[PDB]
């Protein structure tokens, strides 16, 4: 899968 | 390389904090070690590990965008949305712009302008209500040079000695610069002040802060181990 940083 | 340099000067500002033991005072007054000229020229506001696949998407404060491949080659595209500069696993740097590049890197140039996509339309920008310092011929703009995910943090180490820390639990960040020998500190609620390591040694800090610090030590030893 796929790890981000702080979301809108 | 004075990449293990900057490391090691890096160990040296935190250890001699944390040894001095800050949150442990019996008055702390940890205002006294703030100083805004400190504050950091550059930051990762924005992130994406797809590692999985490609590797790790970044954007700077300064809204330039970045890519560390999973080759370990990173392309970078300006804030002008036209100049890029590569930089290969032995980083020779090599420069180019959307109109003028090899073949070579078509596919990860399209790859860059995916993750600026992703992140502009999904990613809160981190620091967004600071002033970055202004540069100066001294500096340049840096690229991602390694990063790793730990249970509780992702660690971010800048080609130009700065190390960032943004814990999950509670969104707060650590910016640790070597040169300056300051960490600018994010708290929860999104204030943000810029510390002389030094200064914190004399004045103390809270429980949180000397916390986060204690970490970071660790972190920064398991970068320079490594390398």
């Known amino acids: ?8 | 390389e004075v990449v293990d340099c900057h490391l090691s000067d890096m160990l040296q500002q935190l250890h001699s904090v944390n040894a001095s033991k800050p949150s442990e005072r019996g008055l702390v007054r940890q205002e006294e070690a703030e100083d805004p000229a400190c504050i950091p020229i550059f930051w990762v506001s924005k992130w994406v590990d797809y590692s999985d696949k490609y590797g790790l998407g970044y954007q700077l404060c300064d809204n330039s965008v970045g890519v560390l491949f999973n080759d370990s080659t990173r392309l970078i595209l300006y804030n002008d949305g036209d100049s890029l500069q590569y930089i290969e696993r032995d980083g020779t740097e090599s420069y180019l712009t959307v109109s003028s590049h090899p073949n070579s890197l078509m596919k990860k140039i399209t790859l860059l302008k995916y993750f600026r996509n992703y992140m502009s339309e999904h990613l809160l920008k981190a620091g967004a209500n600071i002033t970055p310092r202004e540069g100066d011929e001294l500096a340049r703009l840096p690229y991602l040079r390694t990063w790793f995910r730990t249970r509780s943090a992702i660690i971010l180490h800048l080609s130009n000695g700065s190390v960032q820390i943004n814990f999950f639990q509670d969104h707060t960040k650590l910016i640790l610069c070597p040169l300056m020998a300051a960490v600018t500190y994010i708290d929860e609620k999104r204030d943000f002040r810029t510390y002389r390591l030094s200064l914190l040694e004399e004045y103390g800090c809270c429980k949180e802060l000397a916390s986060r610090l204690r970490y970071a030590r660790t972190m920064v030893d398991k970068l320079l181990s490594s390398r």
Do not use: A, V
């Not at chain 1, 899968?1 to 809108?8: A, D, V």
């Open chain 1, 1 to 8: 899968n796929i790890f981000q940083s702080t979301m809108l």
